[PDB]
Each structure stands twice: as structure tokens, then as C-alpha cells.
Amino acid sequence: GLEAAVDAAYEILLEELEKHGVRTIVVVGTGELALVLALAGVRLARERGVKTIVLVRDAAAAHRLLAALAAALGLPAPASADAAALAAADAALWAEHGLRVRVADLTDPAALRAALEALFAEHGRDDTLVLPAGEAALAALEPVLRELGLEEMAAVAREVYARLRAALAAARALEHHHH
């Protein structure tokens, strides 16, 4: 179920924060692992002051993730995927909970590089853990990081992803809410 998945992801992230001195987590992609990482990020922000930013492919994906986060927090979802509504929801989520949800076209390497570069300008590269939310995101993220010369960051992204993938396969976040 969802709690077991969030707990397992939280434990993995705690191990990485201690291992790498992480101050900021950037999640690239959508789906169940993106939600689980965002929810673990809510706990990590409250308990450790570590901020999390999720980069999703389009405004529709941002609305879907913000709506699931809203439900988890007991808060209203944004009324629509209007950019102004999404930006306002994002600013509120950041101020109150240390989480962001931003739009970046992951099919476009230049757009993903630009979104990462914005986050690196805000949060730096040394203390930032970048994680893909799935296989497709890993395949998009690795070459971009490698082009930027961030080989260690790419290596950690792949290794931590493998552990998260295995943990979520066992935890089954959504098992109770579909056939």
C-alpha cells in the first residue's frame, strides 16, 4: 500500500542524505514513484529541512500530481491545469511544505537541461540529489547530466533509482486502488 511505499522510499532517502550531504532532491518524471518520492519529500522537509522539486512533462501531469499531493495533505486540489493555477499551487506548496511541482518537457533534452540548470542556480549542484521516477526518465536524464559533466550525479541517480524501483515493487503503492 501507499504508506509502506512512502516509508520504504523515506528510509532510502534518509540513507542518501547521510551519504551525500543532500539539501535538495529533484525528481524527474511522473507516475507512482514520483508521487511516493514527493510524499517522502513532505516528511523530509518537515523533519530535516530538505526540499524536493518534481519536474513533470506537461501541465496536465502537474495537475494530476498536485491533486494527489492535495488529497494526501487534506487540501484542495488546483481547480484546473491553468498555468496561473499551477504556479499559485506550487508557490503555496513550497512555502508551506517544502515541495515544488514544475513543468519541463522531458522529451526535449534542451528543456530538461534548462529546468535542471534553473534548479542548480537556485540550489547548487554539490548538495542536490537528482532522481528519475521511472525508466524513461532515467534514459532522458542520464545523457543530460553526462553532457553537463555531472557524472557522479548521474551514477547516483541510476543507483538510487534501482533501489527505489525494487522497494516500490515490494511495497505496491497503488494495489488497493485499482483492479
Place this chain on the structure above:
Amino acid sequence: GLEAAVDAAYEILLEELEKHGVRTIVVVGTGELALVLALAGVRLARERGVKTIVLVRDAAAAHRLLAALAAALGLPAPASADAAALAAADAALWAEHGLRVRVADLTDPAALRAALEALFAEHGRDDTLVLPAGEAALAALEPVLRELGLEEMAAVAREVYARLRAALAAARALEHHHH
């Protein structure tokens, strides 16, 4: 009206908690009795520490029940029947109010058995009261319980259902909100 129906169901459940040493209530099905049982379960969780889980047939039914529970609690409904939104809403409802809403295909005996077996793994069989929300759910639930050897549980499910059915016929939960 709704308050009279919740009160009547609450009184019946209190009698069963004392009679059987009940720690967990599992409601199988949808409709007015499912809502009334869930609402009585909110009171029982607050007052007695007894948790309630409702098993509904599909994601659409989970959204409809979560939305009615939300309205009763003064909380936002989940934005959609997206599995991630439903799972997040369920985790929040459990943590704050001691209630869950899960999806289990009741037309499929193996799926209902699997969902009950998950709950029995979490909560045990001895202290768990299983109740159908209607005739169709009773007809689905009885053979599954009997196959599991849970004859007493099936007997209580049918007997308590009969009393709840009669009480709700008199109380008329929805009389003021349809023609």
C-alpha cells in the same frame, strides 16, 4: 434523514463491539448503507479506537464514497478517481479518521477473497466484523467467507446486516435529497 440513519447504525455497531470484542469493521459494497456505516465508523474511531475499511467495487465507486465522506467532514473531495489520488485520499482518511476506502472487484470471488485476506493479514480474523452493504454484497461475501472456513463471521455478517437493513428502512438516510 442522514443523522437518524447514522445514529441507528452506530447504536447497532456499539452493541456488536460489546458482543464480539470488535477492533476492526470491514464493510463490503456501495450505496446508502456503505455511507452510513462509514459515517458511524468515523464516530466509532474517535470514541472507541475501532477502525473501519470499506471495500468498493471500482475506482469510480471509491471516488463517490470518498467525496460523500469529504462533504460530511468538511474536507475537499479527491480531484478525480485517479488511483494515485484515491490512494492518497485513503491514506489521509486513515491517518486522521481511522477509515479506509479500497477498491476490490466484488463480482470476482478471487478478488474479494484477496482483499479480505489482505485485511486479515493487517487486522486479524478474530476481532474483525465483516458487514455487507446490501443484498448483492451479502450474496458475494457469504460464499467467500464460508470457503475460508469463517462460518461464524458469515453468520454474524448476515444477522447484523438484517438489523442494519431494517434500521435504515426506518431512518431514510437520503429522503431529503431526492424526489
Place this chain on the structure above:
Amino acid sequence: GLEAAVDAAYEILLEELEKHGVRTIVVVGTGELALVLALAGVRLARERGVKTIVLVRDAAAAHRLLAALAAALGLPAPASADAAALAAADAALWAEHGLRVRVADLTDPAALRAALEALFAEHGRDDTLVLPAGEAALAALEPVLRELGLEEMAAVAREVYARLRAALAAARALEHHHH
């Protein structure tokens, strides 16, 4: 604007509470006067312990009125016009704010009589002020009240309605929110 309309209706209702010893207000109908009366009823419940029940024609009308009340109170609207969602929202509104929104087919005299008779069973006839929300509701309500022998109640309904109609014509509740 809306505040001026609520204030004017509130002042009129205060005068009637003192004049008739009113404990319960029943509003029959939909539209701007129904909303203004419901909002004044929120204030009267908080300040005076007087409860208000609005009888609207169908579930769609109940959702629209509950949604406007929700917006005025800073609360989530019910997710849909599902009867269970409307009944749950109504129970929450009553418990927290002393207001109800019920469905009664005003085109059907027997249905309106039945809905009034339910309220009279709950709240009595002597201390109950019944008000139409518009001309059509007044035309439906007067014969029903007269058949019940409630001639004084019908007379007050018409007289107080006339004063509310004039006050709302001057106050223009919705002037700032349509062309």
C-alpha cells in the same frame, strides 16, 4: 452588492424574530433571495440560535446553493449532486452552521406539503417563519399553507416576502458578478 443584500435581509429577519418569536426559518425556492436568506441565516444561527432550512426544487439546485454557501464560508463545495454527497454536506452544514438545504419538488403540491410537514414535525408550526424565495415559490406555497389551515403563516410569508423583494431590488446582490 452581496453584503448590502445580506445586511438588509438580516435586518428584516431580526424584526420578524422579535415580532413573532421565531426559532426556525424555512425558505422555499431558489435564486438570489434564497442565497441571501441562507447567508443571513448563517449570521442568525451564530448570533441568535435560529436555524434555517432551504427547500430547493431538485438535486442540481441543492448543489448550486450548497456550492455558493461553501464559497461564502471558505469551505469545499460538494463534489457532485449525488444524493449521498448532498445529504452529507447538509448534515455538516447543519451541525456546524445551523443551516440545511433539502430537495423538495415545489411543482408538486403534495411534495411541498410533505416537506413542510417534515419540518413542522421537527420544529413545530408556532415558532416557524416560512418565506418564499420568489414569486413562483410564493404562488406554490400560499395554497399549501392555506390548505393546512396556516392562514397567518401564509399572510406573514407574503408580507415579509414583499419587504425582502424590495430590499433586494435596492441592494443588488449580484450586480458585480454579471454583465
Place this chain on the structure above:
Amino acid sequence: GLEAAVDAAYEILLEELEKHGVRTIVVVGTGELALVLALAGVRLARERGVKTIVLVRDAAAAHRLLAALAAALGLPAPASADAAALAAADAALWAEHGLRVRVADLTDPAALRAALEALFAEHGRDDTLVLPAGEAALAALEPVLRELGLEEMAAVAREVYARLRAALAAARALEHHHH
């Protein structure tokens, strides 16, 4: 991003409050600058007691702006663009946060004049800063103000707009929430 845009607009408005003794801000138009000005107005109301009213072209635009404001404040959006729902949301926003969102057809000079004249009746002309949200709104607002003899107000509207336009071009309120 949005926070940088709100901060930049806030700083400009603070300078104008000191420069002109402003008690009320009226924003004419829709779009990103309308949202940013409304959000800066939330801060100015809390910190300085300065109220802000946004005049938008139609009910659909009022819903979109109220929904984005709701998301920024962690509050439910109005269920629909129903005039009663919009008026109720507006009254709540004014009472709690010192902001209004009203409908005025800016394509119709008489309608814009009427909406401004209502605000001038409520708030006066001397202490009221009127700002367009974009080029089209400036082109609609200038002749109306000039016809009213409010030449200085029109001059300030154009000058402050130019500074806000430049600031928002640099701040990029919506950059993280569209492609």
C-alpha cells in the same frame, strides 16, 4: 518564477503607496499581471491595510482568477462561474483578505466607467490607484479616466504599468508551469 514576480510588483506598489498616499488599488484586466497584482495585494492588505479590487471582463475570467487566488491561499476554488458562487467567493475574499474580484465588460466603455464609478463611490478618487493589467486594458482605461477628468490618475496608471510590465518580463511568473 511567481514569487519573484509578486515580490517585484510588491516593491513597486509600496513605492506608489508612499508616493501617492494610496488606500485602494483597482486592477483592470486579466492575465499574469492581474494575478501577480492580486497576490501582491494580499500581502499589502495584511501588512498595510490597503485593499485591492480586480475588474475582469466576464464571469469565466473571474472564476479563473479566483481559482488561482484560491490555490495560492490554500483555499477551495468556487465550484463554478455561477454569479452567486462568484459573489459569495468575492465577499469571503474581501472579508478575510482585503481583495475583490468583480466582473466588468472592459470592451464596453460605459460598463467600465460604471464599475469604476461604483468603486469611487465606495473608496473615493484621491486615494485610489488604478492600474491596467496589460496593453488592451490600458487602452480601454485611459480614455475612460480622461473623460472623467482624472488625468493624473490616467498618467500614473500608464507610468506604473510600464514599470510593472518591465518587472514581470524579468521575473517570468509562469516560466515553470508551461512549455
